[PDB]
Design a protein around this ligand. Sequence first.
Ligand SMILES: *Cc1c(COP(=O)(O)O)cnc(C)c1O
Ligand SMILES: *Cc1c(COP(=O)(O)O)cnc(C)c1O
Ligand SMILES: [Mg+2]
Ligand SMILES: [Mg+2]
Lengths: 464, 462
Amino acid sequence: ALPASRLAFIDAVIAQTPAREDTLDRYHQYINPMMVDFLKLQRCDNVFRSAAGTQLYDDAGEAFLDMVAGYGCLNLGHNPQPVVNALKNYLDAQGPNFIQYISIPEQTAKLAEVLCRLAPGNMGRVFFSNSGTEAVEAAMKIAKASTGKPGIAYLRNSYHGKTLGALSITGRDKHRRYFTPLLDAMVEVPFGDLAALREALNREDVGALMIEPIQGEGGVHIPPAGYLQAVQQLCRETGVLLMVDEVQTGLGRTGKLFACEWDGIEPDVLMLSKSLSGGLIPIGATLCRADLWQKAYGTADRFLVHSSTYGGGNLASVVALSALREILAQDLVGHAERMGAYFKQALSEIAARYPFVSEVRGRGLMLGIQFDQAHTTWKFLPDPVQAHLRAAMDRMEQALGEMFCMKFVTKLCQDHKILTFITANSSTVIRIQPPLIISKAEIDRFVGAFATVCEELSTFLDLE
Amino acid sequence: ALPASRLAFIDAVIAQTPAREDTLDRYHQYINPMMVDFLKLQRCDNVFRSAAGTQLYDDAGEAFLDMVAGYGCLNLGHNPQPVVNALKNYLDAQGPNFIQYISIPEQTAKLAEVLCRLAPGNMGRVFFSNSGTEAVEAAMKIAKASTGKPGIAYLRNSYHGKTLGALSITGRDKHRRYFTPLLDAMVEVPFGDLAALREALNREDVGALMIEPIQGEGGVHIPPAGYLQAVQQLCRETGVLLMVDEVQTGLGRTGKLFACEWDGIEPDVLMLSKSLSGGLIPIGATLCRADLWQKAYGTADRFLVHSSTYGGGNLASVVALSALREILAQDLVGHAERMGAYFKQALSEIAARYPFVSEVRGRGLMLGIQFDWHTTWKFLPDPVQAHLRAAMDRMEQALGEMFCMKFVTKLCQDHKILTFITANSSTVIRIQPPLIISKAEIDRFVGAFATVCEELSTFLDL
Ligand SMILES: *Cc1c(COP(=O)(O)O)cnc(C)c1O
Ligand SMILES: *Cc1c(COP(=O)(O)O)cnc(C)c1O
Ligand SMILES: [Mg+2]
Ligand SMILES: [Mg+2]
C-alpha cells in the first residue's frame, strides 16, 4: 500500500507494453480526449505496435495499409532500413550532434551542399530548422530582413503551418479564427487571380510572395495552365521575392524531385520538410539565394539573428542525407510519376460512375478525391428563435457533406483496414497520399475497396 | 565536364571523408560565412569528429571540455549510452514513429502521463512539438484560446525563441529589430517590478503572463527574494494565466527537477525542451491544466486546431522518456545542486581577486560570470560630430564585448575549454555544462579560469 518512488514508476511505465485500452485511457486523460472519442466514433481507434514499409501493425498484429503516411513525412515508408542504418551507425561512431553553433557541423555542411545543388533556382544558402512551420518562419524572416518591408502576400486556402508567424500567411479561417490579431501587413490574394496579385504585389510594404506548387491542405489543386510562371514573371516585374513552399510537394511526391520542376519555377527562397526526415528525425530546411542571405544577415550584428537550438544538428542531417539518397536510388521519383498516373486514372474511372464523387486531382502521388453530396407554432416563435434554428440547420446541412466523406474514411479503415484521411483546410477532400514505395498490388487493392465503398454508399442513399 | 547524375553526386558527398578545411569551406559557402569567419577570429573554428559525455574530439583526437552543452540541451552529455540504446532498440523493433495524428501513439502517451506526474502544479495535458520556440508558441495559443484575450505580458530581457510568435514576447531588441511589426497586444513589463506588472496584468487585453524562473539570456539573474511567489499571487488576483518557460531551467539544470520548485511556483502552463532530447532528437513539450485545455480546445471545432506533423512522434518520446529516466536514475538533480554550489563557491573565490570580474550568479549548474586640431573638431559640421560621437561611444560598449570574448578565446585556444556569451547579453559568459560534470572537471576549469584571469590583468596594466 506504500507508494513507489519516481524512478520505479517511470521504470514500470517505460518497460511495460501496455494494453490498448490502457493506452487509450492514457491519451484520453493526458493528451486529447476529443481525438480519442473521435477515432472511436469513426471506428478507427488503432494503437500501432510496429511499422514497416507500407504497413502499420496493431497490438493484435493485424496489418493496415497506410495512405496517410504521416501526412506526408513518410515517402520511404515506415522504418526504412538504410536510413535506419545511417542513424544507428552515426550514433555508434559517437558522432557529435547538437554542436552546430559552437563549432562547424560536418554533416550539416554536407547536406547544405547537396540540397543547394539539387535545388531549383540558384540556391546558395541553407538554414536548418526542425519542422515545416519553422522553415516557413525562416523564409518569412529572410523576406523581412532582406527587403526591409514587412509584408508578404499569400494565396487563399494556403497552408504554411501553425506557429503564429506561419499562421499569418495561412489562408484558412478555421485555423486562424482564435488567434486574432495575427501579423500586420500580410496579404491574402485570391487563388489563380493574377490581376489581383498585381495589386497586392505592387503595395509599398510587400516584399515577398509565398506559394505552394500545389495547394495540399487546401484540397489538391494544381494551378492553372500559365499561372505559376506568370506569377514568377510578375514577381520579377515588381521586385518581389518568390518564396516557394515545398514542404509537402517536395522530394519526389508529385513525380519530380521538386514540384517546381514541373513549370520551371526558379524560387528565391524554398522550403522543405516532411519527408526530409526519412520519417525518422524532425527536420526542416530553408534555402535562398546567397545574395538575399547577404542582405538579410551578412553583417556582424545580423549573422546569428535567426538561430535554432536543435536546428542544424549533425544527426538529423545524417538521416536526411540518407533519405534523399534512397529516394534517388530507389527511383521513387519515377515511380511517383508512373504509379501516380496509373492510380489517378484508375480512380477516375470509378469516380465517373458516381455523382457524389466529383473529381480526382493531383500529380504524382499527391492526390485528392472530392465529394459532393446534398406551422402556426412556428409563425409565432420569436424571430430570434427562428433565426437561430434557421442558421443551425444551414450549417448542419453543410456538415452533412463532410460527414459523408468521413463515412468513407471509416469504411475503409473498418472494412478494409485502409487508412486514409481528409485534408486540414477542406473536409470534403480525401487525401490520397501513399508512401512512394507503394505497389501496383496495393494501389489496385485500394481502387477496389474504394469501388466497394462507393457501391455501398450509393445504396444507402437509395433507401431514402 | 560533364555533370554527374544526382545519385552519384550524393553518394560521393556521403562517401567523402572531408578534411577539416573542406568542411569549413563547404560551410562558408552554403551555410553561414560570417559565422565561419567569426570562429577563425576567436580561433575556435573546430570541426568535431566525435563526442562523449563532457568531451568533444577533433580530427586528430584532441579533447575539448564542453561547458556549452549545446546551449543547454545536453544535461546528460554527448551520446549518453542508455538513451542511444533506447533509440536503437525502438528502431530495431520497428516502432512506428510519426503516427500521432492518424492513430493513438503508445509511447507518447506514456511520456505525457509521466510529465504530468512530475510537473509542478496540476498539469493534465501535454502538447508535443519539436523545439523550444514551438512549445512557447503552443503556450501562447492555449492562452489566446482559453481566454479569448490576445495579449500576453512578458518581462524585459526575456527569451522565448525565434519564431515570430515567440519573438513577439522576447524582450530583447537585438532579436526583434529587423522583423517589426510583431504581434499586437503583447506588453513588455520591466523585470523585478510588481507594480508595472499589476498595471499591465489589469488590461482587459491581457490573458496571460509568461516568465522564466531564471532569465537565461538576460545574464543568469535569480529573481529577487519574494518576486515569483508574489507574481503567482498577482496572477491569481487578476485572473491572468501564469505561464512558465522552463525550457532552459527544467530537467535538473538548477538543482531541482524543475526550477519552479525553488519557489513553489505552480504554473498554469509550463514549457519544456532542450535537454528533453537527451541530446539526440528534437522535441518540445507544453503542459497545462486540463480545464484550461477544455476551454481552449475542448470542442468539435477546436480539438485539432493546434497540431504538428512531427509533434508527438513515438521515437522522440522514447528518447525523452529514457533521458528523464536517466536524470532520475543518476541523481543528477542532486549532483547539479551539489556540484553547482561548489563550482559557484570556487568561482567566487577567484573573482573577488579581480575587479573586472564583478559577479557570479546562478543556481546549480546554470551559472554566469559578469565582467567589467582643436578648431578642426570645432568646425566640423554638426552631423559629422554627432556621427563620430555616436560611433565612438558604441565602441565604448563594444570594448567590453571584446573583453569577455577574449576570455572565451583564451579558454578555447590554450586550454581546450568551450564557453559562450548569453544570447541577449554579451558581457556574461555562460557556464552551463552537462550535469554529469565531475569535481575534477570543475577543478580543471576553475584552474584554467584563474590562469586566464591573471593574464588579462597582467595585460591590463599597459
Ligand atoms: C505540413 C505543411 C507545413 C508545416 O509543417 P509542420 O511540420 O507541420 O510544421 C507547411 N507547409 C506545407 C505546404 C505543409 O504541407
Ligand atoms: C532556447 C530557449 C527557447 C527557444 O528554444 P529553441 O528550441 O531554440 O527554439 C525558448 N525559451 C527559453 C527559455 C530558451 O532558453
Ligand atoms: Mg463522378
Ligand atoms: Mg571582483
